[PDB]
Amino acid sequence: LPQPNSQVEQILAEFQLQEEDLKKVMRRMQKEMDRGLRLETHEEASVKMLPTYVRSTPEGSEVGDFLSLDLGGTNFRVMLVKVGEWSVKTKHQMYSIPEDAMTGTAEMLFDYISECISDFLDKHQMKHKKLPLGFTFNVVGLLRDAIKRRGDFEMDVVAMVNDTVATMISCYYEDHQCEVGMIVGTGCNACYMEEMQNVELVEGDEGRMCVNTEWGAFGDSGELDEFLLEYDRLVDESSANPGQQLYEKLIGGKYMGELVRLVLLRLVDENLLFHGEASEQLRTRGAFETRFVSQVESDTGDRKQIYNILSTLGLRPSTTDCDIVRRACESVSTRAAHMCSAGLAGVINRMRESRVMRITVGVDGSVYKLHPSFKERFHASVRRLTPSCEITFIESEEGSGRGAALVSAVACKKACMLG
Ligand SMILES: O=C(Nc1ncc(F)s1)[C@H](CC1CCOCC1)n1ncc2c(S(=O)(=O)C3CC3)cccc21
Ligand SMILES: OC[C@H]1O[C@H](O)[C@H](O)[C@@H](O)[C@@H]1O
Secondary structure, three states, X not given: OOOOOHHHHHHHHHHOOOHHHHHHHHHHHHHHHHHHHOHHHHOOOOOOOEEEEEEXXXXXXXXXXXXXXXXXOOEEEEEEEEEEOXXXXXXXXXXXXXXXXXXXXXXXXXXXXXXXXXXXXXHOOOOOOOOEEEEEOOHHHHHHHHHHHHOOOOOEEOOOOOHHHHHHHHHHHHOOOEEEEEEEOOOEEEEEEEEOOOOOOOOOOOOEEEEXXXXXXXXXXXXXXXXXXXXXXXXXXXXXXXXXXXXXXXXXXXXXXXXXXXXXXXXXXXXXXXXXXXXXXXXXXXXXXXXXXXXXHHOOOOOHHHHHHHHOOOOOOOHHHHHHHHHHHHHHHHHHHHHHHHHHHHHHHHHHOOOOEEEEXXXXXXXXXXXXXXXXXHHHXXXXXXXXXXXXXXXXXXXXXXXXXXXXXXXXXXXXXXX
């Protein structure tokens, strides 16, 4: 790599977060999680720490057979599942959606889906049962409505679990040390197994329960204020919910490309990029897509991806411009990974207080899966902040559908247990 421009690096260095800063943030996140878990402060807590009612032990044993419905792009999988003593038995059918039903109203699509479910129930002689059904990936309402509209067979569509909870469970299927689920995509959230005695919103002492942190809300009371840059404040001011979800705004894919756009305009204004002239597309809110960040960071060193991204924005960038854009993208990404690791570090250090603790964390989301070096920087930062823990990270892939089927089993059992 070459000798970097000194004035560009001075602007990009603002994004740096040292260990001490991350320790502060992590420590602040832990206080906020404490507030969320306690009865007396839960209603006022910004970080809600929602009990999911997903317990460490088996419940809802009166659930044998259920349907799992995997909703994909242009098709869907209908699956019959039997849980035994657990022994997950499955059989399934892939259906392709006609363009006829793809291009109609949402009602006509779910009419089609119900028809397919009916066919599947006929094939396996199950139409007398009345099974619970869970979704995997107001589709619920659409399906409830479409089933009622049919009125031949009877079915119970259950409430979905949160996506962090689905992530943790499907990963749990492949690794029983998985006790944390995390999403870094358009938003950012995490769930983990908490001791029952810490979950004050549910009476009970024994075992563990999954808690949905909903930690994106963090920042409400100023916990992030000293870490916010001019670009962050601009993104906040122009958002749908200014002053809310400040943690998520520092991390999620929703605002990542926009932060980069603002860093590039700052550099143009300093006459350090594009000769002090920005295009109209670059001055357009939303024009720099988050997907562009990961494309720019994928570049092998030839600058063809960066040049081709920047050319779609009416810019004619020299090789130096391209290198600057790479570095602007890297600073934003790296900061997101640092902020995210402080949240996860807080959770893992808290769990450790009740147990080398060996733990698996299940992770999903476009930012985490698709961004070139994000997961790596994120891993190294989390591990740095979690002494006396050995952390394994896995992405759910479940190449047979059984992790997905377990997600539906748990959701159906919980719906039953809750009435
Ligand atoms: O069913 C569960 N919880 C519920 N809460 C409320 C309901 F209505 S249901 C738990 C959930 C897991 C989630 C991840 O953290 C650990 C617990 N659950 N799910 C599979 C499983 C197995 S298993 O036999 O499936 C295992 C070999 C694969 C044994 C023991 C408890 C098991
Ligand atoms: O999709 C990841 C997360 O995004 C947002 O933070 C949602 O509030 C949360 O419910 C979800 O888990």
